[PDB]
Amino acid sequence: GLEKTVKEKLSFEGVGIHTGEYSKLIIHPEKEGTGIRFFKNGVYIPARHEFVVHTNHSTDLGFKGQRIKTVEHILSVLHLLEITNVTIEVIGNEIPILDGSGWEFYEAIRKNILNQNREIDYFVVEEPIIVEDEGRLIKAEPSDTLEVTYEGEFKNFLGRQKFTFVEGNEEEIVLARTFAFDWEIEHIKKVGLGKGGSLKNTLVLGKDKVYNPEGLRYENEPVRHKVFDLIGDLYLLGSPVKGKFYSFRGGHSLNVKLVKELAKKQK
Ligand SMILES: C[C@@H](O)[C@H](NC(=O)c1ccc(C#CC#Cc2ccc(N)cc2)cc1)C(=O)NO
Ligand SMILES: [Zn+2]
């Protein structure tokens, strides 16, 4: 495909899920060969694995004393639409969580895509690789198209679920909300996370119920969002990715570990 940017400045705002603090976000058009990067307090933070500063419950980027939390959702949308050249300006400490899914980002960007005139240099997975972490596992292997599978153990009514993204079904994961279990809420609050959490932006899961009045968006909404998360983290490779991925109980830390190992092997 051709490199892509946005045809005008796109604006978004809302609290961050973890900081609970309001952020103003502006997506700026950029020329060919610019890449995806964030901008905060006069500092450009490239959307690349080298700038990752934290990876639990979220993926956070940092550079020159400036930090931006929870970049995975907006990066996933950009990855799905193969937007390659924009600057994501942020006033605040965290990307807005909005409704907890990628819908608002996706709808606005898709509506304002500008095709540019240079072919995309894809990150193509060259060979099979497996990363593990005491039960957790992620495997990557060559594929000319992006395919991403996540399988999880939820230990509640959801049980064991899996979902597979293939190119063409991008919109089957952009509505999947971020989620939390009721048994981890106390811990989340204690370590200073989830301060922006509410039923308006988070799917809250119980043992045999959903705390959200409207219930689930999909019968397998959580694993859909996990795929959505992985695609976001995968874009930290610096280019749109072509490969086949399988994640079992993976998280941001394991996602970034795979990214870093893939980057090292193909540099
Ligand atoms: C799922 C993960 O991959 C990951 N999500 C999180 O880490 C996460 C952690 C905690 C919350 C929360 C909350 C709340 C609440 C609340 C509000 C009101 C009442 N009355 C009671 C509870 C949300 C997301 C993620 O998507 N990363 O991209
Ligand atoms: Zn997420």
Numbering used by the authors: 2 to 268
The publication says:
We chose Aquifex aeolicus LpxC (AaLpxC) in the lipid A biosynthetic pathway for structural and dynamics investigation due to its exceptional thermostability, which has enabled both NMR measurements and crystallographic studies (for example, refs 13, 14, 15, 16). We show that these enzyme-bound inhibitors dynamically access alternative, minor conformations in solution in addition to the ligand state observed in the crystal structure.
Replacing the tail group of CHIR-090 with a substituted biphenyl diacetylene group generated LPC-011 with improved antibiotic activity due to minimization of vdW clashes with the substrate-binding passage. To provide a direct comparison with solution NMR investigations, we determined the crystal structure of AaLpxC in complex with LPC-011. This structure reveals a single conformation of the threonyl-hydroxamate head group in the active site, with the threonyl Cγ2 methyl group packing against an invariant phenylalanine residue (F180 in AaLpxC) and the Oγ1 hydroxyl group forming a hydrogen bond with the catalytically important lysine residue (K227 in AaLpxC). The threonyl side chain of the inhibitor features a trans configuration with a χ1 angle of 180°, a rotameric state that is less energetically favourable (7% population of all threonine side chains in proteins) compared with the alternative rotameric states of gauche- (χ1=−60°) and gauche+ (χ1=60°) collectively accounting for 92% of the observed threonine side-chain conformations. Since the observed ligand conformation in the crystal structure represents an unfavourable χ1 rotameric state of the threonyl head group, we investigated whether this group could access alternative ligand conformations in solution. However, the measurements also revealed that the threonyl side chain of LPC-011 can readily access alternative, minor conformational states with a population of 0.23±0.03 for the gauche- χ1 conformation and a population of 0.12±0.01 for the gauche+ χ1 conformation.
